[PDB]
Design a protein around this nucleic acid. Sequence first.
DNA 1: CTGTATCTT
DNA 2: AAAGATAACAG
Length: 223
Amino acid sequence: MEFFGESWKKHLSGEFGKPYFIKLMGFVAEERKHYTVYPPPHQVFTWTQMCDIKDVKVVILGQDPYHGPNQAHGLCFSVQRPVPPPPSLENIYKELSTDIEDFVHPGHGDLSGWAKQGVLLLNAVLTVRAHQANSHKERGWEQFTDAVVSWLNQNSNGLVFLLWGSYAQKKGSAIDRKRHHVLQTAHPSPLSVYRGFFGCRHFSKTNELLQKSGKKPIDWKEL
DNA sequence: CTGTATCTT
DNA sequence: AAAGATAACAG
Ligand SMILES: O=c1cc[nH]c(=O)[nH]1
């Protein structure tokens, strides 16, 4: 039992031996010696421990992990108790509130509830240097998350991809737009939320798309 | 008033 | 590549 959930490791292990991955892990290792890197090592792959890869139905793709102390824990936009929801998450909650009638602020920021239902909470970049947004971009993470997106794209069907922000949107070309649904909008951070995230209705839209594909909708309130 | 993207150069 | 300009609002 460890970092990678079994089904994910089984389908993503081929990346482990590739030079970019070995180099990526080396960079992250080196960074952790000189700076605080988020999330902690045992939580970088939390997104593989919530459900079987074949049970993924929705993929929310963010930019990179929260860069503040105690925030990031491996699920994009999620913070474990007792850490209060960061600005981005408060905005996600505000959107859910107007988008989903029954949605009410859960009193915490832990999104494991969605992840357990098949919502992959992935970030384009999986580690970040403390206090430096997107500091670990272009070091190899993108190729790894490309592998995750590619596998899902090729082996699943009717997945709903939620690409939040410019960086997450780089994965768009990797998805078969007829085989899957790709919804794109601005990143929920206060610095960009006003550019489309508010009013995007991605949560209700995701459920509509799921229902049309004959899949059970995500209970966004189940947190 | 300080901290939490996106576009342009 | 990296940083300036722009931007919106909570604590
Ligand atoms: O996990 C997170 C948190 C904030 N912003 C992101 O892109 N991802």
